[PDB]
Design a protein around this ligand. Structure first.
Ligand SMILES: [K+]
Ligand SMILES: [K+]
Ligand SMILES: [K+]
Ligand SMILES: [Mg+2]
Ligand SMILES: [Mg+2]
Length: 136
RNA sequence: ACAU
DNA sequence: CGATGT
């Protein structure tokens, strides 16, 4: 603790895992939805969590914002730190879209800089992250 | 185990 | 109950 209220919170939503994946980012303080990705027909939870963080980085950089990003995903936070999404999802025609987006997110990380702190949302202490989809 |  | 991850 405590929550850094001046921040952006992101989360994934899915129908199946693997399954249809979407994500959104919200203002932690107000819950205002700031971006939402169009559903991707097949992906994993962790790919979506990773894309959500990287999109948040790009969103904040474009707006000259130094706010931190909260994510509840230990996995995706590490993948962003490493600049490498170590997903097990098969690469085939059905998964080509998500894998293109993941590849492109890695490429952006490898060609840009940021100081944005990427923080673990402490669900056990604080309840669900403010960007949660309410599907569980 | 822990995080989803 | 199933799956994705460190
Ligand atoms: K949910
Ligand atoms: K959660
Ligand atoms: K497991
Ligand atoms: Mg999540
Ligand atoms: Mg959630």
């Amino acid at each position: 603790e405590e929550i850094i209220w001046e921040s952006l919170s992101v989360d994934v939503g899915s129908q199946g895992n693997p399954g249809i994946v979407e994500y959104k980012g919200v203002d932690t303080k107000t819950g205002e939805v700031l971006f939402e990705r169009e559903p991707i027909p097949i992906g994993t939870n962790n790919m979506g969590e990773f894309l959500a963080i990287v999109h948040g980085l790009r969103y904040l950089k474009e707006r000259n914002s130094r706010k931190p990003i909260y994510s509840d995903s230990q996995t995706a936070i590490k993948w962003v730190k490493d600049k490498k999404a170590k997903s097990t999802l098969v690469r085939n025609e059905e998964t080509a879209l998500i894998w293109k987006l993941v590849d492109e997110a890695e490429e952006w990380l490898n060609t840009h800089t940021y100081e944005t702190p990427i923080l673990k949302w402490q669900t056990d202490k604080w309840g669900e992250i403010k960007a949660d989809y309410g599907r569980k």
